[PDB]
Design a protein around this ligand. Structure first.
Ligand SMILES: C=C1/C(=C\C=C2/CCC[C@@]3(C)[C@H]2CC[C@@H]3[C@@](C)(O)CCCC(C)C)C[C@@H](O)C[C@@H]1O
Ligand SMILES: C=C1/C(=C\C=C2/CCC[C@@]3(C)[C@H]2CC[C@@H]3[C@@](C)(O)CCCC(C)C)C[C@@H](O)C[C@@H]1O
Lengths: 10, 238, 238, 10
């Protein structure tokens, strides 16, 4: 579920 | 003449780009080294992964992007990432070498190097002609960054939900750009139209890249050389 | 005295290990360079990923492993991979430096370098004492490879189905090892017991590594620096 | 479903 994208988007 | 709101937008986008594009390219030494089957895939996988992080950072500083829902931010980045990378790479592209030159011979990428990451001329021919024509426009950095933001904030992407909000944001940036060319770019009478055509070219380049990325990702021997971020962004998950 | 079957097994395992452990370490230059937060995680992620591929290649040449079902082969590799890596790394470990020395100062890993990949002394203290005690056993390469195969073919791993088949395979290798020490290793009266204790130590090292890998993998900022193969092998999927 | 492991195991 887009774990890296979510984190980088903060 | 430009308003304080339009002008503030340009300031924000130029600073955002300066914060996320490092002209020294000193970080490139941290990538898996280039090797010149698919010998260049490790190095270019790291280059693209590093560039996705920069595009995410650029997007976060576009006025209004952060205010979108996380789902829309993801939808926009997954569809547009490869296009923004192709746009932003023009800054290292060189007409005399027909190559991307990133501060040193080890980080000079020609057409042949990219074939060594699995790509055929069906992608590399239009990609290089795209870089050439974009370089010939001799865009001001103000226009270069507006075009990246306009590309990013395109509402006609699969997965977008708040189409109306994103279209308004994109319309504002398009008006900034059209105005800027009118007042600040002499001889720019036909420039706005040529830049919009470049956005259409990127859609076709996106389509071809997705075909060839699909080939790579269906072979675990090669997909294992990618990075987690690349697999997530270029992946098909919803 | 050893039989032709036992002896053939030793031949196969030694050749398998020679084919999958390159004493020149020349491939290490292809990893993301070492940097001395978590500056060593990229380089050590690539080292471990490269090593997992070698352990897979070693396992495929163990007599009987290929004949297991794919599901059992995966179950064994996912549970044992980190243990085989810890075992096989003893070949580069050095008692005078208390470090792993892989043909050059850039690829010399001390305790401090490993802390720069997220690990605490709760793992590094037992790991280094394990390397020391294993190095003091001064194993013949025949014994070193038998111990890796015995570790790999342990039926008491989660997810294993054909427990009976894998136990028989492991019993055969244990008998080869015990015999080999009896005939070929002078002063090896207590060596078999000490090696089996090392297998028990590895279980505890495995447990501690899994805790600390769980920390790393739950933070996307750090898990994104891993490789697809590492995420798949050290991951919890079934 | 362990795509890399399956492929490497051949
Ligand atoms: C990425 C950037 C730069 C170069 C970009 C290049 C040259 C090399 C080839 C590139 C990257 C091409 C853009 C897409 C293409 C590409 C089609 O093989 C990418 C495919 C990736 C692969 C893993 C499937 C350098 C600098 O300007 C920074 C900028 O962000
Ligand atoms: C991997 C090998 C070698 C060294 C291994 C080392 C030294 C460095 C630290 C290592 C790798 C440790 C074993 C586990 C540990 C480790 C606990 O941080 C690994 C954790 C990985 C991270 C991504 C969570 C060199 C050579 O003998 C080849 C052999 O296969």
């Amino acid at each position: 579920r887009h774990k890296i994208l979510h984190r980088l988007l903060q | 003449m430009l308003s304080d709101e339009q002008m503030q937008i340009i300031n924000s986008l130029v600073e955002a780009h300066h914060k996320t594009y490092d002209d020294s390219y000193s970080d490139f030494v941290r990538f898996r080294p280039p090797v010149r089957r698919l010998s260049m895939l490790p190095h270019l996988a790291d280059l693209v992964s590093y560039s996705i992080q920069k595009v995410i950072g650029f997007a976060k500083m576009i006025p209004g992007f952060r205010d979108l829902t996380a789902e829309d931010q993801i939808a926009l980045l997954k569809s547009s990432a490869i296009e923004i990378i192709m746009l932003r790479s023009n800054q290292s592209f060189s007409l005399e070498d027909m190559s991307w030159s990133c501060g040193g011979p080890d980080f000079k990428y020609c057409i042949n190097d990219v074939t060594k990451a699995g790509h055929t001329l069906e992608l590399l021919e239009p990609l290089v002609k795209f870089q050439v024509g974009l370089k010939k426009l001799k865009l001001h950095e103000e226009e270069h960054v507006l075009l990246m933001a306009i590309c990013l904030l395109s509402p006609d992407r699969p997965g977008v939900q708040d189409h109306v909000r994103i279209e308004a944001l994109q319309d504002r940036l398009c008006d900034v750009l059209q105005a800027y060319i009118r007042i600040q770019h002499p001889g720019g009478r036909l420039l706005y139209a040529k830049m919009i055509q470049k956005l259409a070219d990127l859609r076709s380049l996106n389509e071809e890249h997705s075909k060839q990325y699909r080939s790579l990702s269906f072979q675990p021997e090669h997909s294992m050389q990618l990075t987690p971020l690349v697999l997530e962004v270029f992946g098909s998950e919803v």
